[PDB]
Write a protein that binds this ligand. Sequence first.
Ligand SMILES: CC(C)CCC[C@@H](C)[C@H]1CC[C@H]2[C@@H]3CC=C4C[C@@H](O)CC[C@]4(C)[C@H]3CC[C@]12C
Ligand SMILES: CC(C)CCC[C@@H](C)[C@H]1CC[C@H]2[C@@H]3CC=C4C[C@@H](O)CC[C@]4(C)[C@H]3CC[C@]12C
Ligand SMILES: CC(C)CCC[C@@H](C)[C@H]1CC[C@H]2[C@@H]3CC=C4C[C@@H](O)CC[C@]4(C)[C@H]3CC[C@]12C
Ligand SMILES: Nc1nc(NCCc2ccc(O)cc2)nc2nc(-c3ccco3)nn12
Ligand SMILES: CCCCCCCC/C=C\CCCCCCCC(=O)O
Ligand code: NA
Length: 395
Amino acid sequence: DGAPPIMGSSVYITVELAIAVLAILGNVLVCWAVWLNSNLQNVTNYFVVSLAAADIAVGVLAIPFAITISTGFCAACHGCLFIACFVLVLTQSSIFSLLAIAIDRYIAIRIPLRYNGLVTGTRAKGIIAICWVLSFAIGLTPMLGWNNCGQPKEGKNHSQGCGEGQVACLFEDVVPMNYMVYFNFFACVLVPLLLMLGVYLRIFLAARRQLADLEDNWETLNDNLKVIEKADNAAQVKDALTKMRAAALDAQKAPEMKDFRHGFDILVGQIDDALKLANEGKVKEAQAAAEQLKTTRNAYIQKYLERARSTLQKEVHAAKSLAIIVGLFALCWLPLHIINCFTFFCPDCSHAPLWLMYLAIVLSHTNSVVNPFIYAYRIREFRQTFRKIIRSHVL
Ligand SMILES: CC(C)CCC[C@@H](C)[C@H]1CC[C@H]2[C@@H]3CC=C4C[C@@H](O)CC[C@]4(C)[C@H]3CC[C@]12C
Ligand SMILES: CC(C)CCC[C@@H](C)[C@H]1CC[C@H]2[C@@H]3CC=C4C[C@@H](O)CC[C@]4(C)[C@H]3CC[C@]12C
Ligand SMILES: CC(C)CCC[C@@H](C)[C@H]1CC[C@H]2[C@@H]3CC=C4C[C@@H](O)CC[C@]4(C)[C@H]3CC[C@]12C
Ligand SMILES: Nc1nc(NCCc2ccc(O)cc2)nc2nc(-c3ccco3)nn12
Ligand SMILES: CCCCCCCC/C=C\CCCCCCCC(=O)O
Ligand code: NA
C-alpha cells in the first residue's frame, strides 16, 4: 500500500512551476530596468544582471530538469549527469557574481580615486565571461569521470526496466557525495561565502574609520579655535594654529571640486596669515585674524564635511543591501548542503526523509525569486525604474 506517489508529486511539481514563473518575471524586470536607465548602467550592476540571468535560467532550465529527475526515468548515465548537475553551474555562477560585487564595493570605498581607472566596463565583461566558463567546468566536473556511472544500482535499473547502458536517473545514485560535500560544498561554496563575509566586514570597518577621521579633523579645528581664544601667549597661539593646519590639509585630502578647493584655500591662507602674525609676536592680531576662520568654517568647511559624511552613509547603506542578498543565498542553499553532510558523514543515521529533501530543493529554488524584491525595497533607482516600467508597459 502507501499513498499513491502521484499525489505528493503533483504538489511538488505545482510549487516548482509557481517558483519558475516568478523567477523569470522578476529577473526579466531587473534586466529591463538596467537596459532602460543609464543611471543603472555601471560595473556593479553588470554583475547584478549576470546574477539575474542565472536566476532566469533556474526558471527556464533547472526547474524543468529538477521535475524530470524526480521521476527517476531511464537515461544514458552521462545524459542523466548533465540534467542532475546543470543547476550547479548556475549556482556557481551566482557565487562568482556575488563575490565580484563584494570586491567591487571594497575597491570603491578603499581607493575611490583609483576606482574608475581600475574597474572598467570592458574589464568587467571579461571577468563575467571567465566566471561563466569556470562555472561550467566546476559544476560539470562529474561528467569528466567523478561519478557513479560505473557502479549502477542494478535492482533499481531492472525494476524500472531500463535498457542497456541506462540507469534510473536519481541524483544520489549518480552524483558522488564526496564530490558534493568536499568539492562543491566546502571548496566551492563555503570558502567563497566566508571570503565574502570578510570583505563585507572590511567594507564596514573602512567606512567606520573614515567617518571617525572626518570627525577627528572637525573637532581638532574647533578645539584649537577655543585654545587660541583662551590663549595669553604667542607660542600657545602658534602651537594651536600648527595643529589646526595639519587637520586642514588632512581634511582637504579626504566642477564640484573647484569650489571645494577655494574653501580650503581661504582656510589655509587664513591660518598662514595668523601664523605669520604669531611668529612676530602679535598675539592680539593673531587672535583677531584667527577669528576670521569661523566664517570660513561655516561657509565652506562644515558644508563639505556634511557631503563627505552623507556619501559614506550612502555607501554603507548600499553595502548592507548587497550583503542581505548574500545572506539570503546562504539561508536558501545551506539546508541542502547540511543534509548532504548528514548523508555522507553519518552512515548510522537514517537518510533525511523524502518530503524534507524536496522541501530543501524547493527552498534553494526560491532563492531565484527574492533578489528583485530586495532591489525594489532597498535601492531607490531600481524601485523608481520598476514603477515606471510597470505603469507604462503593463498598465
Ligand atoms: C533550451 C535549449 C536551447 C537547450 C535544452 C537542451 C536540453 C533540453 C537537452 C540537451 C542534452 C539533452 C540530454 C542528453 C542525453 C540524454 C540521455 C537520454 O537517455 C535521455 C535524454 C537526455 C537526458 C537528454 C535530455 C534533453 C537534453 C538535456
Ligand atoms: C541554515 C539553517 C536554516 C539550516 C537549517 C538546519 C536544518 C538543515 C537541519 C536542522 C536539523 C537537521 C536534521 C536533524 C536530524 C536528522 C536525522 C538524520 O537521520 C538525518 C538528517 C536529519 C533529518 C537532519 C537534517 C538537517 C536538519 C533538518
Ligand atoms: C554554518 C557554516 C558557517 C558552517 C557549516 C556547518 C556544518 C559544516 C556542520 C554543522 C552541523 C554539523 C553536523 C552535526 C552532526 C553530525 C553527525 C555526525 O555523526 C557526523 C557529522 C555531522 C553530520 C556534522 C557535519 C558538519 C555539520 C553539518
Ligand atoms: N542530495 C540531493 N538529492 C537531490 N535529489 C534527490 C532527492 C532524493 C534523495 C534520496 C532518494 O532516495 C530519492 C530522492 N537533489 C540534490 N541537489 C543537491 C544539491 C544541490 C546543491 C547542493 O546540494 N543535493 N541533492
Ligand atoms: C558565456 C559563455 C558560456 C560558455 C561556456 C561553455 C564552455 C564549456 C566548458 C567546459 C564544459 C565541460 C563539460 C564537459 C561536457 C561533457 C560532454 C560529454 O562528455 O558528453
Ligand atoms: Na542564483
